[PDB]
């Protein structure tokens, strides 16, 4: 299944519109927040660059977006379409998955295709020697590890436990956090919990048993995927531990309804970190406007229409996205809008230099070279749709600037601080998770 | 760059770590004298016997397309495209390093290219969900951590420190060892991880961290060959006494300990049990840089070993038949990997084309679905060059692995013999090593070196 758009040059893309599937099935239940909300964002972005004449005049941009069901193995088979002819896409947008993007970055570098990701924050992916053509528009998790230590220190937390999921994100997340925890020497790790990729039903129950084993470890930090946070949160309800644990979430648990859907009892008092973001007005009036028989390009949009609205029979075409009361403009939708813009700006700069005077695609750059285009991406400096400045580094990373969100009840995430350079957290939460209480003078 | 171009009806791939990693320098430079040319010539020796075997693929004339990985995952995958240019690579026999083998396996899976690894002990390739076209003869890192965990329990070593090598080999070994240590009441101290490419000053940092828990006289080592020598070199400088429990990376090869040979006196190393090949000993010894034109790297190998040059009219006098020959402990696995699909191709030939001992025009397009799935099945056959009074047999389990046969090695300092590796036991699903052979475990030597965190307290 592909949503290819005919154009002068095609842009590769990987979006997890589906989820990881249990058993032999390589695909699971459809993911509303990750995927589809970001799938049409790039399409909306691709429909805006081709409209204005100030960016790539008389040059239409195609697409070769595919499906990755949150599976590392399934992502490599689909990516073969990009390099089938070179065994032609000019650039490929990396997938959200940290482990998924790694397996696409070590094969696209063989055929020299630059990669720009939007939701992968692997500290490993910052190695220039192994990942030559990988570019990132979000700060790495190594900056989050320092931020979490600063947050817990401001909250006087001393005894915490870490939970990580299998892959290159959870394993590389807690490890960075643990190493930076020892550097300050203020906080210590009670224990490390490993979540298998394909565990049993009772395995998650055993996870909460180890957390309850250290009953004084009130605060627990989780580095898990989107579908793993909900399962661990659900296990707390079945163990009668509502309120005993305060959850410490990473960027995988930003402002998102799905991890807190039908679970607003254990998720209360949970503080999470998300990078800089803003609510873009352009995409607000785009997703709510697209309906059936209009956005026929997106094959999975029909599945999105069925799953979201039914939440059964009588599938009449008389409902709108606005009345669903579930459209929130997910935080990482912005990061894919400017991801293609950075690659588009690099192509515009490349077009001007290699084709002087030629408004159209001059034949001098018809066989686009990834190595030549790679240096242009590193020097892109412009302003995004919301207004944030988009700039890369020598390793292709992004400056570290985050936001602190704390889940409140009145069920809406509220900004309670920031991590510009050191900290900006302003007092809610409650002081706890302190072992070795003062034993009096 | 330089590749072997043996020709035949169907060619067979290969990927060996001929050179050593150069790090910040060039991609890979100096050759390997034990895991390089010795393993490289093992495949050619095995291929020559098959091509002259009337009972194994008669008239097929198996070819060779051995590439070069030289201990670099990125370099191995960069040249792995030659294996997929046609898609004619019917199979790939390579991946001596866990990191190298993982990267190649993912690429070859897309084009249904069966792969055999003669040395890959990582306990993740057994997962058929991610690698459904992978088979190997060596055991995984499942019945290897238990052997080292039981040795620690045998010597009552409770408080130990673990050193991990960054990659897909050290991390997997630590996780397997950590769960076994916890289940055996073995305490775990601070664990230090060494990167794939780090400065020599950083290697002094990790040994300092190990010295920051002085009741941890026992260090469990999970490193590759190129990462264990640096730690030993970092042990002579800033002198310290640390007994070593070594993984498969250390092995019995006499190059990771050469030089800094005084800092691993009480080192225990676990390798894979095997036997020397008498026929291969004569083949490797009777080689010359002039006659052996098949190997492009043999000329370079004649420069490091038998130090001379090809420009000043040097060389042409030294012979490998004079100096003693030390066969690598994993040569048996290399020759078993070649014969693994040699019998499978003969079995496939007997069933698909039961008309003549040639190509029947149906086996020309090689498919991984019919080949590997019939190859992971019973290919039980007698091990080639098997010694007498032995019952070894080459076979693959449902996970495409081998039997868990191991052995124990210790480092000797006997007088008038410099240094020597001695086998003191094996692992036949249970420890069997003796105590009278270890120099520091002898009764007339004093208390054994132990690592307990709290001297036990009496009642
Ligand atoms: C991008 O442009 C801005 C304009 O003020 C300036 O900071 C600098 O030239 C660039 N920024 C970075 C971080 O390179
Ligand atoms: C210590 O090891 C010895 C064998 O050398 C044996 O008595 C037993 O395994 C251990 N004994 C105690 C008391 O820990
Ligand atoms: N960046 C995290 C979270 C991705 C997401 O689901 O938004 C990862 O790579 O797993
Ligand atoms: N099996 C060890 C060493 C293999 C070898 O080079 O002999 C590894 O995967 O690193």
If you had to describe this structure to a student in words, what would you say it looks like?
- Chain A: L-glutamate binds at residues 98, 119-121, 169, 251, 332.
- Chain A: It is found in: Cell membrane.
- The structure is cut from a larger assembly and holds chains A (441 residues) and B (459 residues).
- With 441 residues, chain A is an alpha/beta fold.
- Chain A has helices spanning 32-49, 72-79, 98-108, 141-154, 170-184, 201-213, 226-238, 281-287, 300-310, 333-354, 370-378; strands at residues 9-15, 61-67, 89-93, 115-117, 134-136, 159-165, 188-195, 219-223, 246-249, 271-275, 382-383, 389-390, 402-408, 412-418.
- In chain A, a hairpin with a 5-residue loop joins strand 11 (382-383) and strand 12 (389-390).
- Chain B has 459 residues and is of the alpha/beta class.
- Chain B has a domain at 144-275 and 405-428: 3-Layer(aba) Sandwich (Rossmann fold), CATH 3.40.50.
- Chain B is built from eleven helices and 17 strands.
- In chain B, strands 8, 9, 10, 11, 12, 13, 16 and 17 form an eight-stranded mixed beta sheet that branches. A five-stranded parallel beta sheet of chain B has the order 4-1-5-6-7, with helices on both faces. In chain B, strands 2-3 form a two-stranded antiparallel sheet.
- In chain B, strand 5 (89-94), helix 3 and strand 6 form a beta-alpha-beta unit.
- In chain B, helix 2 (73-79) packs parallel to helix 3 and helix 4 (145-154) packs across helix 5 (170-183).
- Chains A and B meet through helix 2 and helix 3 of A and helix 2 and helix 3 of B.
């Amino acid at each position: 299944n592909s949503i290819r758009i005919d154009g002068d040059i095609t842009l590769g893309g990987l979006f997890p519109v589906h989820g990881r599937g249990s058993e032999g099935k390589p695909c699971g239940e459809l993911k509303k927040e990750k995927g589809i909300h970001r799938l049409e964002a790039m399409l909306f972005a691709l429909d805006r660059i081709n409209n204005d004449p100030d960016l790539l005049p008389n040059i239409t941009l195609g697409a070769r977006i595919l499906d990755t069901c949150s599976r590392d193995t399934h992502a490599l088979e689909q990516s073969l379409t990009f390099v089938q002819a070179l065994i032609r896409v000019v650039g490929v947008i990396g997938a959200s998955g940290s482990s998924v993007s790694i397996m696409v970055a070590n094969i696209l570098r063989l055929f020299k295709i630059p990669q720009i990701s939007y939701a992968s924050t692997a500290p490993d992916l910052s190695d220039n020697s192994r990942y030559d053509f990988f570019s990132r528009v979000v700060p790495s998790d190594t900056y989050q590890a320092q931020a979490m230590v600063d947050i817990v220190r401001a909250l006087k937390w001393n005894y915490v436990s870490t939970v990580a999921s299998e892959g290159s994100y959870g394993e590389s997340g807690v490890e960075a956090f643990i190493q930076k925890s020892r550097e300050d020497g203020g906080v210590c790790i009670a224990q490390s919990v490993k979540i298998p990729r394909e565990p049993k039903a009772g395995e998650f129950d055993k996870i909460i048993r180890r957390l309850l084993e250290t009953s004084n470890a009130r605060a627990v930090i989780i580095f898990a995927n989107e579908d793993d946070i909900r399962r661990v949160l659900e296990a707390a309800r079945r163990a009668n531990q509502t309120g005993h644990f305060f959850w410490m979430g990473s960027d995988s648990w930003g402002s998102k309804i799905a991890p807190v859907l039908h679970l607003e009892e254990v998720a209360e008092g949970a503080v999470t970190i998300l990078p800089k973001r803003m609510s873009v007005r352009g995409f607000d009036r785009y997703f709510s406007s697209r309906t059936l028989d209009n956005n026929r390009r997106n094959i999975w949009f029909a599945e999105f229409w069925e799953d979201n609205f039914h939440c059964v029979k009588k599938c009449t075409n008389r409902e709108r996205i606005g009345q669903d009361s579930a459209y929130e403009q997910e935080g990482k939708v912005q990061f894919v809008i400017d991801a293609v813009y950075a690659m588009g700006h690099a192509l515009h700069a490349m077009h001007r230099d290699l084709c002087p005077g030629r408004v159209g695609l001059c034949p001098r750059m018809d066989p686009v070279d990834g190595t030549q285009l790679l240096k242009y991406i590193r020097n892109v400096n412009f302003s995004g749709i919301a207004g944030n400045p988009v700039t890369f580094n020598e390793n292709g990373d992004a400056p570290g600037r985050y936001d602190i969100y704390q889940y409140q009840l009145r069920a809406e995430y509220k900004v309670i601080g920031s991590w510009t350079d050191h900290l900006h957290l302003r007092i809610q939460q409650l002081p706890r998770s302190i072992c070795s209480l003062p034993c009096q003078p | 760059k330089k590749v072997l171009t043996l020709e035949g009806d169907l060619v067979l791939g290969g990927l060996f770590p001929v050179h050593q990693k150069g790090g910040p320098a060039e991609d890979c430079g100096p050759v390997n004298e034990h895991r390089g040319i010795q393993r490289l010539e093992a495949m050619l020796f095995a291929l020559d016997r098959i091509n002259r075997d009337p009972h194994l693929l008669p008239g097929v004339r198996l070819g060779a397309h051995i590439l070069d990985s030289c201990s670099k995952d990125t370099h191995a995958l960069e040249q792995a495209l030659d294996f997929v240019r046609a898609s004619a690579i019917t199979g790939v026999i390579g991946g001596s390093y866990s990191d190298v083998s993982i990267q190649v396996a993912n690429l070859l899976r897309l084009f249904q290219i069966p792969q055999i690894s003669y040395a890959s002990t990582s306990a993740k390739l057994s997962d058929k969900s991610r690698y459904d076209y992978f088979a190997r003869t060596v055991p995984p890192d499942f019945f290897q951590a238990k052997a080292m965990a039981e040795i620690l329990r045998f010597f009552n070593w409770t408080y130990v420190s673990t050193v991990a090598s960054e990659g897909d080999y050290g991390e997997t070994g630590i996780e397997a060892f950590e769960l076994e240590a916890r289940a055996r009441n073995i305490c775990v101290a601070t664990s230090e991880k060494v990167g794939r490419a780090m400065s020599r000053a950083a290697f002094e940092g990790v040994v300092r961290a190990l010295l920051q828990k002085p009741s941890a006289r026992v260090a469990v080592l999970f490193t590759r060959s190129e990462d264990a020598r640096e730690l030993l070199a970092a042990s002579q400088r800033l002198n310290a006494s640390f007994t070593w429990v070594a993984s498969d990376g250390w092995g019995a090869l006499e190059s990771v300990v050469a030089g800094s040979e005084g800092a691993a006196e009480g080192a225990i190393t676990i390798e894979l049990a095997s036997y020397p090949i008498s026929d291969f000993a004569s083949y490797f010894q009777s080689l010359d840089p002039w006659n052996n034109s098949r190997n492009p790297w043999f000329r370079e190998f004649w420069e490091q070993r038998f130090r001379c040059s090809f420009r000043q009219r040097d060389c042409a006098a030294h012979s490998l038949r004079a100096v003693p020959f030390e066969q690598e402990s994993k040569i048996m696995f290399v020759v078993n990997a070649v014969y693994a699909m040699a019998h499978a191709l003969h079995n496939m030939h007997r069933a698909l084309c039961p008309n003549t001992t040639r190509l029947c025009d149906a086996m020309r397009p090689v498919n991984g679905r019919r080949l590997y799935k019939d190859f992971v099945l019973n290919v039980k056959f007698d091990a080639p060059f098997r010694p007498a009074d032995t019952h070894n047999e080459v076979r693959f389990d449902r996970f495409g692995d081998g039997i868990g046969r191991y052995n124990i090695f210790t480092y000797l300092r006997a007088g008038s013999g410099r240094y020597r590796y001695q086998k003191v036991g094996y692992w036949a699903e249970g420890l069997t090593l003796d105590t009278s052979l270890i120099p520091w475990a002898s009764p007339s030597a004093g208390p054994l070196p132990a690592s307990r965190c709290s001297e036990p307290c009496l009642q």
